[PDB]
Amino acid sequence: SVVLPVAKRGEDILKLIAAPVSANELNSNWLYQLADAMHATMLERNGVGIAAPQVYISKRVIIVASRPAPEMNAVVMVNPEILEFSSEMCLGEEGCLSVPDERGQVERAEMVKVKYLTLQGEMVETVFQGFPARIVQHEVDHLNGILFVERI
Amino acid sequence: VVLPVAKRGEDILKLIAAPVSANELNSNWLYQLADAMHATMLERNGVGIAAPQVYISKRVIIVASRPNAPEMNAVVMVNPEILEFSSEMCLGEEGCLSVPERGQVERAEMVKVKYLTLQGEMVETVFQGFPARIVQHEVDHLNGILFVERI
Ligand SMILES: O=C(CSC(=O)[C@H](Cc1ccccc1)CC(F)(F)F)c1ccccc1
Ligand SMILES: O=C(CSC(=O)[C@H](Cc1ccccc1)CC(F)(F)F)c1ccccc1
Ligand SMILES: [Zn+2]
Ligand SMILES: [Zn+2]
Secondary structure: OOOOOOOOOOOHHHHOOOEOOOHHHOOOHHHHHHHHHHHHHHHHOOOOEEEHHHHOEOEOEEEEOOOOOOOOOOEEEEEEEEEEEOOOEEEEEEOOOOOOOOOEEEEEEOEEEEEEEOOOOOEEEEEEEHHHHHHHHHHHHHHOOOOHHHHO | OOOOOOOOOOHHHHOOOEOOOHHHOOOHHHHHHHHHHHHHHHHOOOOEEEHHHHOEOEOEEEEOOOOOOOOOOOEEEEEEEEEEEOOOEEEEEEOOOOOOOOEEEEEEOEEEEEEEOOOOOEEEEEEEHHHHHHHHHHHHHHOOOOHHHHO
């Protein structure tokens, strides 16, 4: 697997709205390869999530992978949409692979309901709670051109 | 896979693309990116393409001259760098997949270019005429410049 270089704060790739994955790209070796390189890069940097823009790819693909932090199976999400944010809020320390040695506290929704496509192109809707929810929110923020430092 | 192409107005096209790292050379990832760029260029009837045009902010281009012009084999260039521009200029009709306006643009008639192959071999070559325009156009994409800004 390839470990990819990661963009840092100050690079404007992080400030765009990433383009949706088109229909022809679903279930393609192009998309599987992209996701595998993201995944490998996330593991090599000890991240618990990653977004394509952070590897210079302005496409709506994220990975949510909470691990020590509670432990989940990693989930790849293509064109994710948060359909509902809870009004209940949780605060917690966040970091970012794109913002080396800078931590802060961000208020996030405690639960989100998210609709996304798998790499094959199947639609799934999943509710996230707690730390996994914060990860989803942070990564969707990356796809929209927002760093966490802007929500401190 | 035919990739969607960004259009003039989208910021992805104005960035300075980031160099491809050593780890990506000779990887299934890179070959797959180049294949997808190549297929996209063909489906849109282009003679070149640069990764930023398919939402990938990386310094990869293809140069693929053919009539409607010399016929060449498609060359994939990683981290290309123009080492020299001739002071001799030449004007030619250009179009762009991202500006779907044509225009008459002045280019260096000759360029000397260094790049990496997909396998990681470092290579140097000179281009003349239309292939040299194509190279200049695509390197401009890597530095956030569209041909309409040169008119
Ligand atoms: O490994 C990190 C480095 S940063 C990280 O994993 C971000 C994900 C994240 C961390 C904490 C809260 C929400 C999201 C990844 C980014 F920036 F690549 F998306 C980590 C930070 C805090 C707690 C546990 C682990
Ligand atoms: O299909 C086009 C439209 S554009 C095109 O192929 C651009 C490449 C180009 C064409 C002509 C001169 C210089 C560059 C592609 C771009 F934008 F991706 F780089 C075409 C134009 C002139 C000659 C042959 C074909
Ligand atoms: Zn981040
Ligand atoms: Zn162009």
